[PDB]
Amino acid sequence: LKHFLNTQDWSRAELDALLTQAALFKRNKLGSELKGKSIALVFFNPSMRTRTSFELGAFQLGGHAVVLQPGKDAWPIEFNLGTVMDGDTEEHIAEVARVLGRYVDLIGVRAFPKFVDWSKDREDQVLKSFAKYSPVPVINMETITHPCQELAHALALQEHFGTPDLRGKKYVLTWTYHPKPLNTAVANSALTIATRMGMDVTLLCPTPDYILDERYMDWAAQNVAESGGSLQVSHDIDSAYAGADVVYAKSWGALPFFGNWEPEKPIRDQYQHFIVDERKMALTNNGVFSHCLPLRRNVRATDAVMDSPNCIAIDEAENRLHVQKAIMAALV
Amino acid sequence: LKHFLNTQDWSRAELDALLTQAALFKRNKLGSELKGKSIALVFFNPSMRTRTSFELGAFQLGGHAVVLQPGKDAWPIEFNLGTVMDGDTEEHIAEVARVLGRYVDLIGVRAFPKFVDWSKDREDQVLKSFAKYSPVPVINMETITHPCQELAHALALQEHFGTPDLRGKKYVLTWTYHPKPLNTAVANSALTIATRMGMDVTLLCPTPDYILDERYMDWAAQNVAESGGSLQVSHDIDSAYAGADVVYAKSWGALPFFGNWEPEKPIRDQYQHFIVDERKMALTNNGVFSHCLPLRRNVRATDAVMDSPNCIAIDEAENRLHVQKAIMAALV
Amino acid sequence: LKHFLNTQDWSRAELDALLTQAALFKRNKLGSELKGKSIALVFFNPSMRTRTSFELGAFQLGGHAVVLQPGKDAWPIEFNLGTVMDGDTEEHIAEVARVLGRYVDLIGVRAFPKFVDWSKDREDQVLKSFAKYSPVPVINMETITHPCQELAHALALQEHFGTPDLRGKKYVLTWTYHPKPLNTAVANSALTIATRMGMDVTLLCPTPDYILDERYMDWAAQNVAESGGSLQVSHDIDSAYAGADVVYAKSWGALPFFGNWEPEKPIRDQYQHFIVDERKMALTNNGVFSHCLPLRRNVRATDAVMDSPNCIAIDEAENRLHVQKAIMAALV
Numbered sequence: 003l004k005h006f007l008n009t010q011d012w013s014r015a016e017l018d019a020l021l022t023q024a025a026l027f028k029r030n031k032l033g034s035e036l037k038g039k040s041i042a043l044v045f046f047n048p049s050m051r052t053r054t055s056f057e058l059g060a061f062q063l064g065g066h067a068v069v070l071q072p073g074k075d076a077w078p079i080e081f082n083l084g085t086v087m088d089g090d091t092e093e094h095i096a097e098v099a100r101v102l103g104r105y106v107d108l109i110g111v112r113a114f115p116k117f118v119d120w121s122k123d124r125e126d127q128v129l130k131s132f133a134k135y136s137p138v139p140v141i142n143m144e145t146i147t148h149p150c151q152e153l154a155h156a157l158a159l160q161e162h163f164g165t166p167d168l169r170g171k172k173y174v175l176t177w178t179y180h181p182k183p184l185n186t187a188v189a190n191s192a193l194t195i196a197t198r199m200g201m202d203v204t205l206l207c208p209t210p211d212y213i214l215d216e217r218y219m220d221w222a223a224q225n226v227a228e229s230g231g232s233l234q235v236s237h238d239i240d241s242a243y244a245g246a247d248v249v250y251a252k253s254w255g256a257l258p259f260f261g262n263w264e265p266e267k268p269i270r271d272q273y274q275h276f277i278v279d280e281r282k283m284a285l286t287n288n289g290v291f292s293h294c295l296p297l298r299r300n301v302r303a304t305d306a307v308m309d310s311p312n313c314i315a316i317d318e319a320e321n322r323l324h325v326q327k328a329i330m331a332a333l334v
Numbered sequence: 335l336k337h338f339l340n341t342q343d344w345s346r347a348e349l350d351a352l353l354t355q356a357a358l359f360k361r362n363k364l365g366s367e368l369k370g371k372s373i374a375l376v377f378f379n380p381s382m383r384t385r386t387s388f389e390l391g392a393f394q395l396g397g398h399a400v401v402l403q404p405g406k407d408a409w410p411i412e413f414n415l416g417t418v419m420d421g422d423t424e425e426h427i428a429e430v431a432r433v434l435g436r437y438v439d440l441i442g443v444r445a446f447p448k449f450v451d452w453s454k455d456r457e458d459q460v461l462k463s464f465a466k467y468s469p470v471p472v473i474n475m476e477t478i479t480h481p482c483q484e485l486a487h488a489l490a491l492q493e494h495f496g497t498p499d500l501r502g503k504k505y506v507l508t509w510t511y512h513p514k515p516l517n518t519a520v521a522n523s524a525l526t527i528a529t530r531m532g533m534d535v536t537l538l539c540p541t542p543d544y545i546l547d548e549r550y551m552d553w554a555a556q557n558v559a560e561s562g563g564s565l566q567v568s569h570d571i572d573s574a575y576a577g578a579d580v581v582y583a584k585s586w587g588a589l590p591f592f593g594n595w596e597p598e599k600p601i602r603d604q605y606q607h608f609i610v611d612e613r614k615m616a617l618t619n620n621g622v623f624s625h626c627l628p629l630r631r632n633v634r635a636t637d638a639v640m641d642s643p644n645c646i647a648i649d650e651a652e653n654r655l656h657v658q659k660a661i662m663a664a665l666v
Numbered sequence: 667l668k669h670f671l672n673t674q675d676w677s678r679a680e681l682d683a684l685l686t687q688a689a690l691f692k693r694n695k696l697g698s699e700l701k702g703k704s705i706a707l708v709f710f711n712p713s714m715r716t717r718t719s720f721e722l723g724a725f726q727l728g729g730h731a732v733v734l735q736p737g738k739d740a741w742p743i744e745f746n747l748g749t750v751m752d753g754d755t756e757e758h759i760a761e762v763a764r765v766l767g768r769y770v771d772l773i774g775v776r777a778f779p780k781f782v783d784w785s786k787d788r789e790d791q792v793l794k795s796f797a798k799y800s801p802v803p804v805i806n807m808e809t810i811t812h813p814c815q816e817l818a819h820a821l822a823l824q825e826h827f828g829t830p831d832l833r834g835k836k837y838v839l840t841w842t843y844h845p846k847p848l849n850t851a852v853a854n855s856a857l858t859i860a861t862r863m864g865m866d867v868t869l870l871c872p873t874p875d876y877i878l879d880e881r882y883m884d885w886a887a888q889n890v891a892e893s894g895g896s897l898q899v900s901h902d903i904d905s906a907y908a909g910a911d912v913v914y915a916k917s918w919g920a921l922p923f924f925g926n927w928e929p930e931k932p933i934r935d936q937y938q939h940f941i942v943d944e945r946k947m948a949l950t951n952n953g954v955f956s957h958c959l960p961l962r963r964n965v966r967a968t969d970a971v972m973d974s975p976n977c978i979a980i981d982e983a984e985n986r987l988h989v990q991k992a993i994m995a996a997l998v
């Protein structure tokens with residue numbers, strides 16, 4: 003049984019086929035690939051684009067999406083095995099995934115880490131549990147990685163540059179400020195897809211403490227050897243932006259401080275100048291800027307940058323709809 | 335780009351066409367005006383009729399409605415420009431409206447005032463923000479006015495009286511009691527549509543403090559000159575009901591007390607006798623009674639009045655479905 | 667007007683026809699029995715299977731389900747008549763049921779008791795109110811009984827045993843442990859359907875205090891006389907399980923303690939050995955085990971029992987989808 007948990011799990015040819023099918027769906031949105039079929043969108047966290055894009059995608063392909071929010075409308079779920087369920091959880095993922103598998107043809111799942119034990123979070127327990135117990139294909143709607151975002155992002159870049167081949171492009175994945183620590187998922191995914199596409203990647207962050215988990219630094223290195231790009235880490239803004247073709251921002255809490263954010267607060271606070279602004283973008287090679295959204299204006303990026311014609315965030319968000327339809331069509 | 339934010343923005347001919355298309359849809363509910371199309375119903379406040387009627391309306395016309403509740407499932411939204419988004423809001427309406435515009439063909443929005451600063455509330459910021467940034471038509475699902483309710487109400491009256499022409503009808507918009515201050519939206523809308531239809535309107539309220547915002551008193555005066563009706567303010571129940579053909583109730587907090595309800599409480603409390611009862615209705619010319627709902631029984635109106643054959647509240651509620659389908663069909 | 671509030675309200679022939687139509691729908695899931703029609707699923711409590719199965723069922727038959735949660739998205743509802751609605755409720759069920767009846771073709775309702783006054787809860791006020799005021803058929807999605815679960819359960823048993831006739835089967839309805847008191851609905855329903863099918867039923871519970879309401883003990887006795895089975899009460903585990911063909915578990919709070927759970931806690935706590943385990947199941951005649959779900963593992967039943975091939979809980983859950991489609995098709 004094939005799932006869509008991470009692009010890293012798929013061959014380059016399969017990924018290229020997904021991207022191409024996404025372009026096709028963008029030209030002909032209505033279809034019958036999911037006629038009479040359904041998908042359960044299980045949300046453990048908030049969402050606007052993902053929920054809307056998946057729900058509409060199913061509809062446009064003749065299918066139906068059932069939106070579930072455990073703890074809100076559905077029952078809270080337990081993921082640990084062999085435990086005595088006398089706590090807050092009502093049922094085990096084993097029964098939930100099996101039951102859903104008797105109803106729907108696909109299951110999507112969104113579950114951000116709890117930001118208390120990166121050791122536990124990095125295990126991707128929720129997503130892995132669904133993939134293990136479900137009799138139907140499972141789709142990552144974002145946990146510790148965000149593969150659907152990766153493809154939407156990649157398609158947006160290919161469209162912007164007018165070609166599927168992005169080799170030779172300088173790509174800057176930049177950390178950005180926020181008072182609270184956020185999920186590294188999007189950052190981990192960008193690093194993964196940028197290198198899998200063979201671009202020259204630079205991970206720009208305030209200090210070595212903000213470097214991404216080794217799992218993703220390794221996927222990147224492996225992808226660079228495979229695609230012909232390159233990986234690099236930097237803590238110097240100007241040399242990072244200089245001549246860049248793409249600038250992708252995202253805010254995340256330093257991994258080494260998971261479960262102890264009190265001391266890392268004064269650290270990130272001295273780096274709010276990492277905000278993407280005109281001065282920085284002016285240093286690029288007329289580079290494009292994008293963000294996964296939601297984006298806090300004048301925090302992650304200034305109003306001026308968001309409204310400039312070089313911002314393709316809206317295009318990337320639109321593409322979530324098209325690439326996800328390709329994913330659902332491939333798995334069904 | 336044409337939106338449906340207020341009936342006052344549309345010509346009389348366009349409104350008549352909407353009402354007529356609504357009557358047509360009431361006779362043939364299934365259609366294909368929205369085949370393959372979608373609408374995002376963004377709710378910032380509770381709703382039963384609006385959500386249900388819009389969702390079903392889209393379905394019956396071959397479309398699909400995506401129900402969103404910022405702060406509940408979707409991310410909280412920021413509407414002020416140039417602000418540093420380091421508060422509770424996650425994204426700006428600029429990105430939300432643009433993103434949604436890449437997914438759906440229409441956007442509906444519901445957002446009641448906060449009852450703290452009528453000066454701010456009366457600006458209709460949320461609705462105006464959507465209308466400004468959205469690339470697709472926007473529909474008011476109730477903010478400070480309730481245009482969809484206006485049409486459902488107008489159609490119900492036309493059906494009850496057996497004619498599209500309501501000139502010559504005595505219409506009583508009456509304030510009613512409630513311990514807490516409520517939105518004037520429905521009252522503002524009734525005053526607007528009753529006068530646009532050319533009826534003889536009387537705004538019955540406890541004191542001058544309960545008079546509606548000047549914006550709507552002005553729309554009314556302008557509508558009276560245009561339609562041939564008349565506007566009048568009264569604080570005397572008996573002379574108001576006498577010979578009335580229509581009695582429409584609604585409870586609202588006095589505008590002059592927005593942000594300071596402590597002192598206006600003892601004021602409204604001495605007027606709970608404004609409740610619509612049999613004694614009052616008996617004074618009318620076998621007049622019909624209606625309310626937008628939800629309605630608190632034996633508070634806004636007595637059980638006897640709600641169950642009498644002259645109560646057309648259920649018919650008006652049904653019409654929300656039909657007039658909204660006409661609105662969606664016209665904007666698409 | 668015919669509703670589906672309890673199987674006890676339907677003749678045996680009608681129930682057999684429902685079960686048969688459910689089997690047909692299980693073989694051909696797509697149909698047009700609800701083409702262009704809709705159902706309002708009103709949830710006053712959490713749900714995963716019911717919401718998902720009803721929503722998908724409507725879709726597969728060409729219809730559309732509108733999911734409503736009073737107090738969450740829809741307005742809170744009042745069920746008492748003649749009261750002065752100046753409390754938490756916004757509208758009366760009279761208007762809600764009538765309005766919904768102008769929109770949808772069917773109404774489903776879920777509302778668990780409040781566990782404070784079994785005398786009040788046992789009146790099934792919510793369900794009865796909907797059935798009284800609604801102009802369209804009403805479906806019990808679980809209140810104090812769970813008729814949709816009854817049919818899913820019955821179909822699962824008929825499929826397991828390879829025959830529609832279950833007479834001669836030893837059926838054990840067993841109480842199971844949980845720190846908090848739960849609804850007897852599922853237990854009341856199992857007792858009802860097991861006896862209506864003519865099986866030899868044994869209600870196994872810790873003490874006479876855990877015996878089900880007399881209303882259901884009476885339905886059972888009446889059903890036994892009609893179907894040829896038998897009813898029995900027991901507080902001895904071993905003699906209950908011995909030679910049993912079916913074991914159905916469920917946890918519920920002792921009725922005599924509604925509104926005073928402090929003293930009944932130490933009582934149930936000495937009976938957590940009622941948990942369904944291998945030792946108990948080994949005593950049966952290779953009996954099948956099932957539960958309505960959600961199920962707390964290693965509390966209601968052990969991991970080993972849930973994962974054994976004799977557990978048909980997943981099949982029963984799947985059947986909720988099929989029997990409900992038969993119910994909707996029959997009522998429409």
Ligand SMILES: CC(=O)N[C@@H](CCCNC(=O)CP(=O)(O)O)C(=O)O
Binds near residue numbers: 048187294
């Ligand atoms: C603040 C916050 O927690 N943000 C998330 C955004 C995830 C990417 N964004 C999306 O997938 C779009 P939508 O479906 O609308 O959420 C994060 O940091 O991972």
Ligand SMILES: CC(=O)N[C@@H](CCCNC(=O)CP(=O)(O)O)C(=O)O
Binds near residue numbers: 381384480626628
């Ligand atoms: C108490 C309260 O806040 N009431 C609202 C009702 C609005 C009119 N009613 C509707 O649009 C119907 P539905 O979609 O079910 O809300 C108000 O006073 O403006």
Ligand SMILES: CC(=O)N[C@@H](CCCNC(=O)CP(=O)(O)O)C(=O)O
Binds near residue numbers: 850
């Ligand atoms: C713990 C709890 O309160 N449980 C409920 C389960 C009802 C049966 N179960 C269902 O109908 C399945 P779903 O639609 O997913 O809830 C009870 O005890 O009655």
